[model samples]
Target: ALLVPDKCKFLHQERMDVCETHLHWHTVAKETCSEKSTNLHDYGMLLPCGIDKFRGVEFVCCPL
Candidate 1:
């Protein structure tokens, strides 16, 4: 079960490492998500940023 972001976008860097399936976007604030965010749009972490690492939004992924 792949949870597609409503409108999440990732950076134009090396995005070969896409996140796994069965993850949902944990709707949260950008500031909070950008905690350990190196990919900008990433969530509290980087890898889980998904496609949310675009613009100024971050939909961190979480297990079902």
Candidate 2:
């Protein structure tokens, strides 16, 4: 069954991958909170996790 309304903008388009999205969420568990393992504001704490995956999570300092 297919029905398209005059005002509908995406009625006949092919199944497209989600191209735009916006969502807001928060952690509700204590263990899910960010661990205070280090002070990230320090100038020396900005080094990359590794040369390959620059986006990987890495530590740069100890807890203040």
Candidate 3:
């Protein structure tokens, strides 16, 4: 069975700049799903900043 393609948004913040990005393939029905996340890195401490990564998948058992 083919699982539907899905995506999730992630956020990062710096002194005066905020960055947003996304990850994909996170949901399905009658199937299995998994996700892997890593620290969104800033190579140097050149800004007051941090990053947070969150991800999830849902299986909705409803009428198609």
Give the root-mean-square deviation of each candidate in angstroms: 11.9, 21.0, 14.0
User: Which digits, one per residue and each the tens of the lDDT, describe model 1 over residues 1-64?
Assistant: 2233544443222234445322332333433335544222343323544454422323442222
Which candidate number would show the highest lDDT if scored against the true structure?
1
Q: Please give the lDDT score at residue 9 for candidate 3.
A: 28
Q: Model 3 lDDT vs. the true structure?
A: 0.26
lDDT for each candidate structure: 0.35, 0.22, 0.26
Residue lDDT tens for model 2, 1-64: 2232333221111113222211111111111223443333211111233332122121222233
Q: How much does candidate 1 score in TM-score?
A: 0.19
In candidate 3, what residue range of length 10 has the lowest lDDT sum?
Answer: 21-30
Clash count, one per candidate: 2, 0, 0
- Stretches off by above 4 angstroms in model 3 are 1-52
Error of 2 at 45 (Å): 12
Error of 1 at 57 (Å): 13
Candidates by TM-score, descending order: 1, 2, 3
**Model 2: C-alpha RMSD to truth?**
21.0
